[PDB]
Design a binder for these strands. Sequence first.
RNA 1: CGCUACUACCGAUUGGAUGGUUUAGUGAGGCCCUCGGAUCGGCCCCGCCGGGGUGCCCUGGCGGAGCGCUGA
RNA 2: UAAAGUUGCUGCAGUUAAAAAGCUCGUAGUUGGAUCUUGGGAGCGGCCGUCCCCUGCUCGGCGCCGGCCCGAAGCGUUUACUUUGAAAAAAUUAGAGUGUUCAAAGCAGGCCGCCUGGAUACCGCAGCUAGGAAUAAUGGAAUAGGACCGCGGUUCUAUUUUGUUG
RNA 3: UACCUGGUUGAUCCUGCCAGUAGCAUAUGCUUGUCUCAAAGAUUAAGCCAUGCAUGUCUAAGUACGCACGGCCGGUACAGUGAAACUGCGAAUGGCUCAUUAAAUCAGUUAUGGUUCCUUUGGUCGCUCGACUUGGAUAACUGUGGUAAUUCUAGAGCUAAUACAUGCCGACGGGCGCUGACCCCCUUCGCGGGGGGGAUGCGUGCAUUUAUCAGUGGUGACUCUAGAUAACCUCGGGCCGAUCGCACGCCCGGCGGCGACGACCCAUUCGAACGUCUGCCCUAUCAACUUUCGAUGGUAGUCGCCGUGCCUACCAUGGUGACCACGGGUGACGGGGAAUCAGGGUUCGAUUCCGGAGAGGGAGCCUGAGAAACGGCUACCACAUCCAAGGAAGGCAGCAGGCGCGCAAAUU
Lengths: 262, 143, 206
Amino acid sequence: ARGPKKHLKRVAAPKHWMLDKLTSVFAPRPSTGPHKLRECLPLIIFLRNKLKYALTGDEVKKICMQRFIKIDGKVRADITYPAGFMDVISIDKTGENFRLIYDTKGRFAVHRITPEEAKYKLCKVRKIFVGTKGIPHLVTHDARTIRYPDPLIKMNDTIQIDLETGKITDFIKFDTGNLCMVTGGANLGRIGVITNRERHPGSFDVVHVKDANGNSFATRLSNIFVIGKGNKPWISLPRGKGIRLTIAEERDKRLAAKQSSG
Amino acid sequence: DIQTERAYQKQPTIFQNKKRVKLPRYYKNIGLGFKTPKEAIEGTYIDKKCPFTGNVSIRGRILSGVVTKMKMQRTIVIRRDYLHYIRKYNRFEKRHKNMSVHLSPCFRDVQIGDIVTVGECRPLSKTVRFNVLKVTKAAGTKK
Amino acid sequence: GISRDNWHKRRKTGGKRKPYHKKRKYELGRPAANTKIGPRRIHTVRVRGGNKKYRALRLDVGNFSWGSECCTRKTRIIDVVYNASNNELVRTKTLVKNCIVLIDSTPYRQWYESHYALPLGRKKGAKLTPEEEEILNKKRSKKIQKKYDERKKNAKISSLLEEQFQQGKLLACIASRPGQCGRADGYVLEGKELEFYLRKIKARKG
RNA sequence: CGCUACUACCGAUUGGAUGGUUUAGUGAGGCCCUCGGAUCGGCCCCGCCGGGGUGCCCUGGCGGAGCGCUGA
RNA sequence: UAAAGUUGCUGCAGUUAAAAAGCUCGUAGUUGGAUCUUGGGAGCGGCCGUCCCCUGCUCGGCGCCGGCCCGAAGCGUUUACUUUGAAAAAAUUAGAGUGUUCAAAGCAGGCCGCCUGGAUACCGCAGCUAGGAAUAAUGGAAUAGGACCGCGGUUCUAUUUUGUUG
RNA sequence: UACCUGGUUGAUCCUGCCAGUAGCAUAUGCUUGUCUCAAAGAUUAAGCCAUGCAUGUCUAAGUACGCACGGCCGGUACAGUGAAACUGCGAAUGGCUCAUUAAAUCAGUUAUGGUUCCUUUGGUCGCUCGACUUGGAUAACUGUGGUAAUUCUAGAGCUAAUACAUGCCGACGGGCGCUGACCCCCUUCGCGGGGGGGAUGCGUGCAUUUAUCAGUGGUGACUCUAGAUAACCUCGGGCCGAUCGCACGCCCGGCGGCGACGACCCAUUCGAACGUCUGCCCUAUCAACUUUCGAUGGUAGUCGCCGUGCCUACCAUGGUGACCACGGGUGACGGGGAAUCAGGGUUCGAUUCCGGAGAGGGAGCCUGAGAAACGGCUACCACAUCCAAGGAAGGCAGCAGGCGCGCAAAUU
């Protein structure tokens, strides 16, 4: 191509959207925004595939242009707006609030949060910058340039912003024994305490993470997010709790739940 | 001794015309735990493409090879021998890729056969993308 | 047009390439500025990304820096003397980066004579008849004459610059690219640099 | 050796036809630089009279030309 | 494409069926003899089988009266090999679930609003990572510019130190 | 399912091939009731194309005096529906094809500390110390036209801006660097020594460009980020808002909510570009090739968005090769993949996903964040269309469709 691409093919769409094969040639190409193309979940796919409030993508145009949807504290009217990790979708006329947390499989799930929980969100910082007059700058994983932050906050720490004001309230520092949601790679959706940092000058630093059933696993430090100091998370967690039961144990629990229920 | 070009040769950073009443030398640690040599700091040479006393940063790949030619000026040809696996004939074949690599004149005593470590950087010339980081001398050759 | 392509030319091995695509845009050459010494003519060029780039074609002044005591002034460029790259870009007086140009001294001589309060240049025998900078050499207060005296103690300039300030023309090294930024900024040659470039101008002379 | 048939081969013909690369000579057209200056202005000038202030001045509508200046 | 072990790595042939150069030397290529950690200390099960151990040198915590026990970052031959880990688009293939009426398909569906699914594997080589050290290469001390020792000296120099300022 | 079988002989055992055997994917023959999916002008000609269509677009919110429609509390302009036209944005995606292309493309793998980036998202947007809203064109409109002809346009009369231009007030009262009149206090017989206030003037924000000095935050490492000094400021000219809409209020004219649009710079996103390591088919009846029209280096420039022989000038004589360079061929776009397949393999991949390339052949450029764009423009070469013979117009390897080519492929 001799400029930017404006279409996304249904087949070339990321697997974690769980778009079917047969409905359309094209997938909703996420608009440019805070989250990456292959790490986001467009508003349309949340609004008509996950929750099924719409039937078509013209229904999603009617929902969003009534201004009933409010992603992380501000009303958007774009059907292909990239809503990503830790974002809070507040559908206000229904009186509902959803956090985009990764399920134990790599998808984003329908995680309903309370109106009090929906007022703050947790943001991993990407870099520390010194602005034009000695002004310290954070940049979060969702492109928030927050200036005059606490000096103890360094890269790979998470900060708790209040949506309404956009100012930091608390922060977890990247230290051992802290909870870690894995937000990239094979372990996408795991939750466990950080047990080891392994430095690599030049190459990528890897981080071993012990789980709530002693299931230790590694991950590239790029693909890591700290969700609470020690063993207490600062968010509410979906069922499975990022523990990742095996396919043999999944089969066992699904079979036990079906036979016992009736 | 030096400055045989038509233009004046100097380090760009260090300023050498301060009012008075030995010139100071710019160097740096290259990173990756590779020691800046003595001849880089104590020496009087001036090379824009030295990874210790020049405008070049080592990033990405660290490789090695054997110094095979030293006839180009300020740069050498190394030779990387490896084994490619043909899976039909469940065996290896001996294959080589010789690459032109820049040789910083802080490495004053380098002979052909010496196992040199090289660092990926920005392209210094048409065919050069690698600076020499350290030289380990050949098997024996203490004399 | 005139291309900046890596594909039009042979490989390490000496094997010619067959070109797989026609000249791209971003693989671009624009004709050389070859900026001269004359009344300021600078042509703005649109470049990649809708950003601007100022082709100086004539340029007669420049913000040159006297790095010894860290002063810089807008000074007239009068002559190109020496170019290390091409010997024929001296006859055709083309300003490029790392040119050796004669510039005016009078902004620096003015600064020196106002800051140090000592007669610099000024061939021995003559006076200043307007009596302006003659009064700016004299007539200070109690403690500020002491400030000028403490400054005067360590106010020695090199005999090389003393000669050049006397003729009214310093040697300067162009540091900016007048082809690119449209400016002819630089620094004044001193110490080993000045001795080097005076030796190269002397060798070219005969 | 002889008859029939087929297939390649050789070669007189400084053979012929589709191409491609190229020495040399010419070289459309764009682009850049450079000199351009058709044309269109706006300005200072005095010829003409007011409103107002007091012959002088701040100005409002009508034309002139040194093309005088500079602009596109 | 298999059949074709009639292209032969697995895996073919070469006395006579087609096939070993007339003979020798010879540089790349390919392949290369043997040899350098072993006997144990400890426990469980019924003499045997699995398990724990045979390198040292800034800051901390099971602490004790500057040291010892322990953890963390770093230093610690080079690979090849093997094992693990990270990472690697989907679609396809393998494959989990699911009565599209069956099936190819599909990614849906199922309960008198709710309950779920949209798994997982594989992804040659090369690059990254941490175990193992048999096998195969490779290294050293042989005019000793060999170690590990504490010593005598020299040159440059963080500055801890003279109530504060030379 | 790890499979063979007929054929040289009078008969025999062999070698060995021919022929059978089963897919698969192109053609074609004959036959064809139901139903569900579904390939389909790739192979030959990236050959030529009639005709139609395939990229346009308006919200409360840039610009409404078309009476084309249309309400009445109008004189404090503009009710509202609104064609056209200006402005903005898009037209660089999508679609098609596989000609070129053999370390190229592409794949895994890294880098960008070597670059650019409309948009989106979040920052910034009284940080500079020095008009209660400016200028005059132009289009639709109206009206005279010309040519045989085109999505050809010319002259004249008007009139809009978020078009093109120009530009102030406020914050604003003062800080901070020099300057430096003046003046104060202490020691000395005094000069001298030593320490504070200070009129005036010159500068000062971010961005651009150069030089210097010191060493807030960050990396494995910057000549990083930030700081300070000195300045510079492209007249073909960085920013600091002369913009629009909703509901409108409180306050002795000031002050304010919720937006839309625009904007320097930073980050983010979408990317794109150029590099790292490794990997490709046949060919030796291709063994030496590359190099003063750059070959491999070095130095300094030019150009470029940046890195670099990318291109100059001057030096150096290098670089690649039996581990197959260089040249040639390819019925070669590459990959994910497909067919067969015990274990190995063999063959194919024009074809819906990713990446690349091209629009009849080369070439050049405009505009824009993005093009060397062809449903953009300018030539040349080729072929071809209207013509009143002066000229004008072209690009189906888009969807249909036609001709041609063919063994070979569907509805204007």
